[PDB]
Design a protein around this ligand. Structure first.
Ligand code: HEM
Ligand SMILES: OC[C@@H]1O[C@@H](O[C@H]2[C@@H](O)[C@H](O)[C@H](OCCCCCC3CCCCC3)O[C@@H]2CO)[C@H](O)[C@@H](O)[C@@H]1O
Ligand SMILES: OC[C@@H]1O[C@@H](O[C@H]2[C@@H](O)[C@H](O)[C@H](OCCCCCC3CCCCC3)O[C@@H]2CO)[C@H](O)[C@@H](O)[C@@H]1O
Length: 463
């Protein structure tokens, strides 16, 4: 090869002068145009292989799934995670934590009720809360952050919080503030030059402080769990982990220690809230812009579910139009546009190039989600992208918003359940309106995560 082709770097500065000022995603897409679907870019000293297009991403993450199963650091959060917890671990630590997390989230949670039942109940609480606004203008950001946070709380703490609980809201505010800071231009600069910038004030110090405050709270919950534990009846993720810590106490090689507990719980909040919340927020923005689509979803809800019974996950298979709409919301939403960093786990043979062991790799998910091979109108909201000639749901190789391979989103099922039940339970009970006429609504957004514009909305009780 030897490494994939790319711009010639400077020492220290890497490919700074070949980057685009609009950000990392724009820098990558521009470089793609010159160098092709697989290229090397130096971010500071670090060479990083970038994978664009559906093929290159699948050839890596699926065809060499084990080789591309490594996880890269994110400079602004590494001082917190330090390669612990389920997202940022590698090797055996990652395998053990992922195996445990998959199994546990599937089986243990608030009131012994299933994840689906907990989401249905959160949706019922949400409908009750929206009813109280009586059609007032609101910004739905807070409530969407609240319901997605409450699902993770149900899983990990075995409880949910009232929407107006002030301590819940103080910690929610400072937690979600972190995402904006992580996806900012300043944090992208920090990705490049952290080795220098860590010695100076900046967003990285605010991100650190916010997440440490959350870690303190998680620590306090772990102590409270331990003090109230019934080993015959584990409540939630924390109880199950404590029991595993007990089961492995005599094994100093075990990953099931305190640091992995705190940071795995943090990881579930970090990965499980913002993306799901912003998807819902983006979805409702689209539903304001395209009332004919929203009307059709409501028609389908009426036909399949009706106007009394709450939506259930079983309904989704009978609702291909609504399902296609959710797919298209995720696709156009493109909330994690250049993926979460991977690494190769060994020197890796890829398209004639050799990628040394531990080289970082970015799967540019955006480039699959906008691939014109797979989506006739990639920049236009089109639920027909996911519907066949008989009006049935159709699957698409370009559709990869949860990534692919061994690192695929651990919470894809939960996220899928949340989108379906929240969208349908809301629309079953409320129509929507806003001060801005549909044609005037602007969908224009961004870093590791995408962020749509702020907007007002009215939830109008139907009946
Ligand atoms: C619409 C919502 C969501 C989207 C689009 C999304 C997408 C993603 C993506 C792109 C990744 C990176 C995979 C990779 O490394 O290539 C990821 C990882 C992850 N996600 Fe999600 N996610 C969502 C919601 C959730 C939820 C609700 C949970 C938990 C219940 C969750 C848990 C995780 C975890 C733990 C990882 C790290 C996986 C690993 O490193 O093994 N996600 N997700
Ligand atoms: O050689 C110095 C100058 O080069 C040209 O500008 C270049 C670059 O030198 C110029 O710096 C600019 O790049 C923008 C800086 C990139 C930093 C932004 C990064 C911050 C971190 C994450 C996102 C990327 O874009 C142009 C790309 O062609 C200009 O045409 C001339 O002013 C001059 O020749
Ligand atoms: O006297 C203080 C206690 O009040 C009650 O509630 C506690 C705690 O038990 C309870 O867990 C609560 O937590 C509120 C904060 C929840 C934050 C969770 C966030 C994590 C990150 C994403 C957003 C959600 O804090 C309350 C105030 O201290 C508890 O019922 C009792 O333990 C005790 O009476």
């Amino acid at each position: 090869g030897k490494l994939p082709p790319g711009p010639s770097p400077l020492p220290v500065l890497g490919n700074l002068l070949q980057m685009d000022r609009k950000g990392l995603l724009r820098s990558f897409l521009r470089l793609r145009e010159k160098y092709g679907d697989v290229f090397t870019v130096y971010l500071g000293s670090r060479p990083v292989v970038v994978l664009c297009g559906t093929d290159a991403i699948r050839e890596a993450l699926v065809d060499q799934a084990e080789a591309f199963s490594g996880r890269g650091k994110i400079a602004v959060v590494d001082p917190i995670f330090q390669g612990y917890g389920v997202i940022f671990a590698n090797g055996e630590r990652w395998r053990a934590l992922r195996r445990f997390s998959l199994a546990t989230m599937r089986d243990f949670g608030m009131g012994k009720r299933s994840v689906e039942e907990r989401i249905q109940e959160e949706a019922r609480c949400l409908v009750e809360e929206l009813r109280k606004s009586k059609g007032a203008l609101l910004d739905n950001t807070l409530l969407f952050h609240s319901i997605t946070s409450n699902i993770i709380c149900s899983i990990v703490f075995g409880k949910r919080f009232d929407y107006k609980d002030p301590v819940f809201l103080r910690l929610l505010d400072l937690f979600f503030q972190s995402f904006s800071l992580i996806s900012s231009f300043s944090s992208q600069v920090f990705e490049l030059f952290s080795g220098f910038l860590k010695y100076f004030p900046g967003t990285h110090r605010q991100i650190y402080r916010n997440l440490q405050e959350i870690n303190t709270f998680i620590g306090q919950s772990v102590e409270k769990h331990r003090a109230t534990l019934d080993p015959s009846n584990p409540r939630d993720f924390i109880d199950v982990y404590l029991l595993r810590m007990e089961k492995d106490k005599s094994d100093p090689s075990s990953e099931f220690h305190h640091q992995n507990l705190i940071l795995t719980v943090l990881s579930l909040f970090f990965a499980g809230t913002e993306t799901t919340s912003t998807t819902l927020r983006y979805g409702f923005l689209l539903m304001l812009k395209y009332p004919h689509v929203t009307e059709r979803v409501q028609k389908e809800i009426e036909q399949v579910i009706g106007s009394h019974r709450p939506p259930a996950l079983d309904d989704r298979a009978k609702m291909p139009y609504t399902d296609a709409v959710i797919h298209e919301i995720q696709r156009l939403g493109d909330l994690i546009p250049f993926g979460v960093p991977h690494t190769v786990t060994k020197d890796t043979q890829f398209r004639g190039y050799v990628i040394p062991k531990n080289t970082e790799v970015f799967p540019v998910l955006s480039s699959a989600l906008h691939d014109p091979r797979y989506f006739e109108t990639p920049n236009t909201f089109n639920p027909g992208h996911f519907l066949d000639a008989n009006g049935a749901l159709k699957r698409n190789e370009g559709f990869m918003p949860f990534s692919l391979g061994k690192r695929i989103c651990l919470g894809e099922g939960i996220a899928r359940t949340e989108l379906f039940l929240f969208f349908t339970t809301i629309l079953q009970n409320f129509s929507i309106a806003s001060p801005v006429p549909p044609e005037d609504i602007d969908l224009t957004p961004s870093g590791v995560g995408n962020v749509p514009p702020s907007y007002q909305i009215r939830f109008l009780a139907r009946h």
